[PDB]
Design a protein around this nucleic acid. Structure first.
Ligand SMILES: [Mg+2]
Ligand SMILES: [Mg+2]
Ligand SMILES: [Mg+2]
Ligand SMILES: [Mg+2]
Ligand SMILES: [Mg+2]
Ligand SMILES: [Mg+2]
Ligand SMILES: [Mg+2]
Ligand SMILES: [Mg+2]
Ligand SMILES: [Mg+2]
Ligand SMILES: [Mg+2]
Lengths: 229, 74, 180, 99, 140
RNA sequence: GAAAUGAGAACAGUGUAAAUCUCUUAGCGAGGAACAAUUGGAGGGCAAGUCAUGGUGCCAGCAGCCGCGGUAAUUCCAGCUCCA
């Protein structure tokens, strides 16, 4: 059973090669619950040179304890980052009693959590947006992270963890600032992620004009969906 | 717990006890300087190593003993 | 003893003594450019950093500003002569984009080797330390010599050494002077 | 009742026989040594685990070169090992062993 | 609000307020009143002394061992100091009443690890190093 | 397998108030414990052991901090290897 049968309307729309690009899903803000939709846009034919290669990384694995009916019952938590270096990043975490299990479930989670980082210009606008449009802030638990845009080739100035996240996002050049208890790795990761996410939340002056008015994919593709397969 | 011979708290005990084992006489020698970092680059960051799966890359000290250098060369 | 000669520091030491990604990159550099000794890469890093501080301060400034005009001009003219910058990028912004990979590529080792004058990035480093190469009007015994785009024309072997038509060295002499 | 028979161990050089005098705490005690000196002993990490010691027990004591005033409690003697010591003629026949 | 003046004539109150609150920072306090100079080293990096006693020191919980030590009479101070003697059977390299070189343990005035309260270590014996002696480079 | 060369060491020449050293240079000066780099580390922080390694068995000792050692020590004493 290596063939994917979509349980989501969006899932159908994706598998059958109807919705064009991933970012489009992001645009119409269609919830992705199915961790297939994502592997779709990232083909496993394995051409080594694409920067659109989708990357997975285990970050954390934690032995979590419970006190239950006189026993001490351990599970594992894990954190996972997924990203193509080009614009797209997700973070996920899962608890399970078997390690490789926690890992798989967390990969799946992270995929469901995919988010569109926005890339801006520091100084004069020439070629590759190497950084963020504004300064922004992640907040998780106690922790805070501030992302400030840096000039060309500054590189990522940031702790090992948020650095890893940012590299997955494909921010080349950045300045970091962190508050809170940062050694809480899940909160640090979370913060960096949410921060990276807020890039598109910020209304910058270039976003000021009237947007395009389009119909949702579902309204256009309504005919397709109501055929019975 | 009925095994005791030496006085507790004697000063040089463990060092005195330790057998003297002689450092092996090396055939030839370890290259000093740049050449050494060449050697390291070779056995570590060289093209063939990079070509192999980065998650399956083999850790630098994995072999203490020579039987696994024989198993590594085969 | 009073003395007015100036102080120097050519390199810098990282905040973080052990980090894999960095160590690995540094050994990829040491590998490809045939260096020894991490500080060589560090001093290259230092140099680049100086360049970048310059460009940055200049970008603070108004584009009209006399100082940015003159000193910026000077920085880019300074790039060409070393061939760190291609013909087309004379804008200060492209300075920042400078790679250590480009800058090490301007080494005399990197130059001699890639000039088919030496078999190996290592063969090179002995050669220019063996006193076997001339650059311009001088004899350069230094691996770290940053190469004038203009002197790239005249890089050939020393008229002093063999490979320069000079007498075969003490080795060949001692081998050959023992008959039968 | 007893733990497995093992050879009664004698005072080697650098050790002395001792009898427990009073209890200090922190695993310490004052001992009368058959050297003829009183000392303040500490209890072995080994003995802290196994054998509980109390007052007027006969113990073997590892000594210290530098500080003679402190000594380490090495091992406790079972009353039979003791009566045997008296037999052998190691420690003096007039001594009080209590059960 | 913020309980802190913001105003352009507020300068001195601000700076004075800091010149006060700064005292709660410990390193500042210890620095500012001479604290360094009164310590057994008299501000110094190391010190020379004479050995009064060789002494064993039973380790803090939960560890058991006998930490080899010495009580030294510092030649500059004439203060008495309790110092640790490092590595293995190095207590043997010491004779009572030698010249001895003593340094901090790396906590700057505080004890390290299982040795309770002992703030100093032995570096040199007579003229030579404990390291030199240990590895057996030189002889006493 | 022969080439390459400086450290060493020298005629001369450069240099000096003179002397030394440098620099230029004849006659010399490389195949292995020599012309042989160390100093600190391989549990985490922190790069490096998944030694069925030997010794010691809470002792000797390690450990900036957490901790390691109580007879199968990833932490002591050593050997190998490996790291900076
Ligand atoms: Mg902080
Ligand atoms: Mg402070
Ligand atoms: Mg320190
Ligand atoms: Mg403690
Ligand atoms: Mg050594
Ligand atoms: Mg002369
Ligand atoms: Mg040779
Ligand atoms: Mg050590
Ligand atoms: Mg063992
Ligand atoms: Mg070891």
């Amino acid at each position: 059973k290596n063939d994917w049968q979509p349980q989501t309307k969006l899932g159908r729309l994706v598998k059958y090669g109807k919705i064009s690009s991933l970012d489009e899903i992001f645009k119409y803000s269609i919830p992705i619950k199915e961790p297939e939709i994502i592997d779709h846009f990232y083909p496993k034919n394995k051409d080594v040179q694409a920067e659109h290669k989708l990357m997975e990384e285990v970050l954390q694995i934690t032995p979590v304890q419970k006190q239950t009916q006189a026993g001490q019952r351990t599970r594992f938590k894990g954190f996972v980052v997924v990203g193509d270096s080009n614009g797209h990043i997700g973070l996920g975490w899962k608890v399970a009693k078997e390690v490789q299990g926690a890992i798989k479930g967390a990969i799946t989670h992270a995929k469901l959590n995919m988010v569109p980082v926005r890339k801006g210009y520091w100084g004069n606008k020439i070629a590759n947006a190497h950084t963020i449009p504004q300064k922004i802030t992640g907040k998780s638990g106690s922790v805070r992270i501030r992302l400030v845009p840096a000039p060309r080739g500054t590189g990522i100035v940031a702790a090992p963890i948020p650095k890893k996240v940012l590299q997955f996002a494909g921010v080349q050049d950045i300045y970091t600032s962190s508050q809170g208890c940062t050694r809480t790795r899940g909160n640090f990761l979370k913060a960096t992620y949410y921060a990276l996410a807020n890039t598109y939340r910020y209304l910058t002056p270039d976003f000021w004009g009237k947007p395009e008015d389009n119909e949702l994919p579902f309204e256009t593709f309504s005919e397709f969906l109501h055929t019975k397969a | 717990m009925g095994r005791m011979h030496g006085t507790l708290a004697k000063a040089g005990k463990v060092r005195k006890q330790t057998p003297k084992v002689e450092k092996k006489d090396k055939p030839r020698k370890t290259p000093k300087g740049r050449s050494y970092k060449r050697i390291l680059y070779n056995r570590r960051y060289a093209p063939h190593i990079l070509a192999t799966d980065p998650k399956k890359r083999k850790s630098p000290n994995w072999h203490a003993g020579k039987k696994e250098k024989m198993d590594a060369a085969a | 003893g009073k003395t007015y000669i100036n102080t120097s520091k050519t390199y810098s030491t990282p905040r973080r003594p052990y980090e894999k990604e960095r160590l690995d990159n540094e050994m990829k550099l040491i590998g490809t450019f045939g260096l020894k000794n991490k500080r060589e890469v560090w001093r290259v890093q230092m140099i680049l950093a100086k360049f970048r501080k310059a460009a940055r301060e200049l970008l603070t400034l108004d584009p009209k500003d006399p100082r940015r005009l003159f000193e910026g001009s000077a920085l880019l003219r300074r790039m060409f002569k070393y061939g760190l910058l291609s013909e087309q990028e004379r804008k200060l912004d492209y300075v920042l984009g400078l790679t250590i990979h480009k800058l090490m590529e301007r080494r005399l080792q990197t130059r001699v080797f890639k000039l088919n004058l030496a078999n190996s990035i290592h063969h090179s480093r002995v050669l220019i330390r063996q006193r076997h190469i001339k650059v311009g009007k001088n004899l350069v015994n230094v691996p770290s010599f940053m190469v004038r785009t203009d002197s790239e024309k005249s890089i050939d072997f020393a008229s002093t050494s063999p490979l320069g038509g000079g007498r075969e060295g003490r080795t060949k002499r001692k081998n050959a002077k023992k008959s039968a | 009742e007893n733990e497995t028979k093992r050879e009664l161990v004698f005072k080697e050089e650098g050790m002395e026989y001792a009898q427990v005098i009073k209890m200090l705490g922190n695993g310490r005690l004052e001992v009368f040594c058959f050297d003829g000196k009183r000392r303040i002993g500490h209890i072995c990490g080994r003995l802290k685990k196994k054998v509980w010691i109390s007052m007027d027990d006969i113990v073997l004591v590892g000594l210290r070169d530098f500080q003679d005033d402190k000594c380490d409690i090495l091992l406790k003697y079972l009353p039979d090992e003791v009566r045997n010591l008296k037999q052998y003629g190691e420690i003096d026949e007039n001594i009080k062993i209590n059960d | 609000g913020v309980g802190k003046p913001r105003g352009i004539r507020a300068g001195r109150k601000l700076a004075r307020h800091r010149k006060d609150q700064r005292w709660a920072d410990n390193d500042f306090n210890k620095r500012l009143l001479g604290s360094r100079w009164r310590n057994p080293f008299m501000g110094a990096s190391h010190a020379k002394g004479l050995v009064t006693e060789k002494i064993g020191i039973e380790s803090k919980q939960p560890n058991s061992a006998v930490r080899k030590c010495v009580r030294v009479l510092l030649r500059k101070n004439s203060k008495k100091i309790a110092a640790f003697v490092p590595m293995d059977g190095c207590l043997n390299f010491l004779a009572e009443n030698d010249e001895v070189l003593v340094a901090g343990l790396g906590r700057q005035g505080h004890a390290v690890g299982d040795i309770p309260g002992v703030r100093f270590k032995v570096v040199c014996v007579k003229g030579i190093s404990l390291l030199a002696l240990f590895k057996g480079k030189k002889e006493k």
